[PDB]
Design a protein around this ligand. Structure first.
Ligand SMILES: *[C@@H]1O[C@H](CO)[C@@H](O[C@@H]2O[C@H](CO)[C@@H](O)[C@H](O)[C@H]2NC(C)=O)[C@H](O)[C@H]1NC(C)=O
Ligand SMILES: *[C@@H]1O[C@H](CO)[C@@H](O[C@@H]2O[C@H](CO)[C@@H](O)[C@H](O)[C@H]2NC(C)=O)[C@H](O)[C@H]1NC(C)=O
Lengths: 123, 462, 123, 123, 53, 52
């Protein structure tokens, strides 16, 4: 199912994610707007892949990072997230702090890359 | 031993598929404002730096008659021709009660022209004036069934409207190349003994095709490619007489056509800001436009074709006869050169027989004995039906000549019964796909599938 | 050569694969069909890259996996594959069992990712 | 800044590279040429990513390799590159030897991949 | 009526020269010279990267 | 066609341009009443026009 994991818990929904990212081509051309859907879908996919890659996450959907989790973002227990809450509710509740997390991930990835380049080279 | 699956990317595996190719041309300069219909307006400059790389261990099957590349080429040519006729003038008021007279031209064996006067709308659109022009007889029809030898009409205005060809475009068949898009490849068979089907033992991957000449012809093939070693005969099925049999020559035959008449280009203001060009007057004497070929070389070529055909027909004699009737557009060799459309009667060419006895023409230092074909010049063209067929080709001042090379023949057999060993060959025409089918018979378009799976003794490093 | 490895053995053809996946742009626009070739080529390339990436193979053409090879797929010796057989013949002979291999690779990659996430985290 | 690092030294300019590769969509369609910019930008991005990936560098902007640096290419000291020289001047000075470096990187990546496949398998 | 035909301008369109901006596509950039002594050619000592004109 | 409760049609004759574009001939056709309008406000029961 394309959205078979929707409605389940976050832990249950964190499985078979590959079916969520296997969109293919469709339709026959009638005018320019038909091709605009294809090119904008390609642009969105490339944007998502580039955003995921600049954080040090390439080729893997699940990617654990080293940025600490601030308690002020959600301030809810672990049993309130992965046991009963769904992904849509969690996204609606956490969308207010996406930019800070993205900036922290970018800074952490750049810092880790620079530290790796410095430590590997000086030996 | 234990084996494990391993995935390989960038694998040279290909399958037959369908795709739209790109047209390309050489680095032709713009030069004057006049530009070709199918050059520097819908294609891309190419580079012949990549070469055809020969694969010495592949056996790829090739097919000629079941190929959509020629159909795609025909569709592209039709689209380009439809596009080219849009910006040119729509004419309109020409077909009226034309008053045609014998004029200064008198009786003769030439096809002659009719001097017709008619009323044309001047620069004022609510006023008329008198003008005159010379028109060809096939382009003139009697107005009504009633007996009247002075009132006439154009052949048009009973069918869809006609658009005059722009004088700032040329119909020169410049060569073109076809290139596959990204992810596709073109395979060319280098074997010289290719009969149309079967495997190819010498295949080469090429970026683009060679120069393809879009010459318009029905009975013969002009300015085509030449065979490598010998004359090669192609046909979908020799048993079926309804099919069309192609003969690809090894040596070209020189052909020289000419229009000795010295026409004069006229200009009539038909509508606001749009001019109409016709033949005003003929200076000098009236002569017959004609085509010339050499009789000895043509006879030798026919004998070569006959001995090549005798391989498939051991106990049957070969005979060459005229076309099986039909209208002027079918039974006559129709082509265009210099801007003028010629229809030449080829009844005097295909007159001979070959029962298996070889005849050689030796000596003959004074070999000026040539064969001449009379031709009729037309201005109203309906070359492609149902896409805006009617076109008026403007005349060109002065006398013209066109020298070209015959490189192929199109024939059709006829049925028989009761041990009839007198089967004959006749010229063939009609469908336009066969003209370009003999030029792209070597190329096949394939789609690359780079993803592959193989077994090998390895495991993931954990 | 774009197809210089064609016709050789599988072992000989498993070299210089980079030339097989370096297609670039070409042509000038005449109508919408000219651009359709570009966008469909881009879509096919993205599809191939996404399919290769969901198996745990990113940025590498050769990618050894951990899925066992069933003997019923080919049941031919190793000397019958990498010594005389070509890639085209092998593809024509093995195309009947592509879906099973793809599904097994997807399941194995998901299982390995989940096991890695579980083992790295619990330490 | 999109080009905030321009004009500084190579060492100073080798920071916050992510802002240099975050181009997104723009414009509304008027004719085919408007869409041609989008598709050619996508093709250029895919070409750059593919060229970077065939050298063994996927998902990382900085990528140290094992190819030796020939002294004939620049024959300048380390203090003449990373201390005062800018990236534009360095590119203008080093553009004459890009093809040799690209070929060496491709050959080295293929050789390393083959050696890894041979050494991992034979154990 | 001695030259090409004429088309009347629509009454429902206006010829007001409203200002417009030119923006480069993705992968390109626009450089503006802020020097006030620019004579048409020569180097610029004050350059700025701008999204649109 | 004569009087009746049906909506009926009107038989209208008019001059049409023949295959010759500088010549005219007479033709006729049946048209529906909603598609036919009087030409002018003046009293004339024989001259009519299309609604367009
Ligand atoms: C074709 O016919 C037209 C008239 O139908 C001829 O034009 C006239 O020619 C005579 C003889 O020279 C002149 O006196 C008239 O003034 C011409 N009239 C117009 C309107 O031009 C024309 O000469 C004929 N052409 C030929 C070749 O005989
Ligand atoms: C118009 O006709 C003349 C002769 O009738 C052409 O002049 C000849 O052109 C051929 C071209 O193959 C030459 O071989 C001859 O030497 C020329 N002279 C003669 C006396 O025949 C002339 O070329 C023709 N016009 C055009 C545009 O070709």
């Amino acid at each position: 199912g394309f959205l078979g994991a929707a409605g389940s818990t976050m832990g249950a929904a964190s499985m078979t994610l590959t079916v969520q990212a296997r969109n293919l081509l469709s339709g026959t051309v009638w005018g320019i707007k038909q091709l605009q859907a294809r090119v904008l879908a390609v642009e969105r996919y490339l944007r998502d892949q580039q955003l995921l890659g600049i954080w040090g996450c390439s080729g893997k959907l699940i990617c654990c990072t080293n940025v600490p989790w601030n308690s002020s973002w959600s301030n809810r227990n672990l049993s309130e997230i992965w046991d009963n809450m769904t992904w849509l509710q969690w996204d609606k509740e956490i969308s207010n702090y996406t930019q800070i997390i993205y900036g922290l991930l970018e800074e952490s990835q750049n810092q880790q890359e620079k530290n790796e380049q410095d430590l590997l080279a000086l030996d | 031993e234990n084996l494990w699956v391993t995935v390989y990317y960038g694998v040279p595996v290909w399958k037959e598929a369908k795709t739209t190719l790109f047209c390309a041309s050489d680095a032709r300069a713009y030069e004057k404002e006049v530009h070709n219909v199918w050059a520097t307006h819908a294609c891309v400059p190419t580079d012949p730096s990549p070469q055809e790389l020969v694969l010495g261990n592949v056996t790829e099957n090739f097919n000629m008659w079941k190929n959509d590349m020629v159909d795609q080429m025909h569709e592209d040519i039709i689209s380009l021709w439809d596009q080219s006729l849009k910006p040119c003038v729509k004419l309109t008021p020409l077909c009226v009660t034309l008053i045609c007279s014998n004029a200064t031209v008198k009786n003769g064996t030439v096809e002659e022209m009719k001097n017709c006067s008619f009323n044309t709308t001047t620069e004022i659109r609510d006023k008329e004036k008198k003008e005159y022009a010379l028109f060809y007889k096939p382009d003139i029809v009697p107005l009504s069934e009633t007996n009247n030898t002075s009132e006439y009409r154009l052949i048009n205005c009973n069918t869809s409207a006609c658009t005059q060809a722009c004088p700032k475009v040329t119909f020169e068949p410049i060569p073109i190349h076809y290139c596959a898009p990204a992810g596709y490849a073109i395979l060319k068979c280098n074997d010289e003994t290719f009969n149309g089907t079967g495997p190819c033992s010498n295949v080469s991957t090429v970026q683009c095709t060679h120069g393809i000449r879009p010459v318009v012809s029905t009975q013969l093939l002009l300015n085509g490619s030449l065979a490598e070693k010998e004359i090669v005969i192609r046909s979908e099925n020799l048993t079926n007489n309804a099919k069309i049999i192609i003969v690809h020559l090894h040596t070209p035959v020189e052909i020289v056509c000419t229009r000795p008449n010295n026409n004069t280009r006229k200009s009539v203001r038909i509508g606001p800001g749009q001019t109409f060009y016709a033949t005003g007057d003929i200076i000098g004497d009236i002569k017959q436009a004609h085509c010339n070929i050499s009789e000895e070389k043509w006879n030798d070529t026919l004998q070569k074709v006959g001995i090549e055909l005798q391989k498939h027909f051991p106990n049957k004699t070969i005979k060459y006869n005229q076309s099986a009737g039909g209208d002027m557009e079918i039974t006559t060799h129709s082509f265009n050169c210099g801007g003028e459309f010629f229809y030449c009667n080829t009844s005097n060419l295909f007159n001979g027989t070959y029962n298996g006895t070889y005849i050689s023409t030796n000596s003959s230092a004074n070999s000026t004995s040539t064969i001449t074909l009379q031709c009729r010049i037309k201005q109203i063209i309906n070359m492609w039906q149902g896409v805006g067929r009617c076109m008026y080709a403007p005349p060109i001042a002065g006398n013209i000549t066109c020298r070209s090379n015959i490189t192929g023949l199109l024939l059709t057999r006829d049925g028989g019964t009761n041990s009839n060993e007198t089967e004959t060959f006749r010229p063939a025409g009609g469908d336009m796909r066969d003209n370009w089918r003999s030029e792209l018979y070597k190329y096949k378009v394939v789609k690359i599938e780079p993803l592959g799976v193989a077994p090998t003794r390895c495991k993931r490093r954990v």
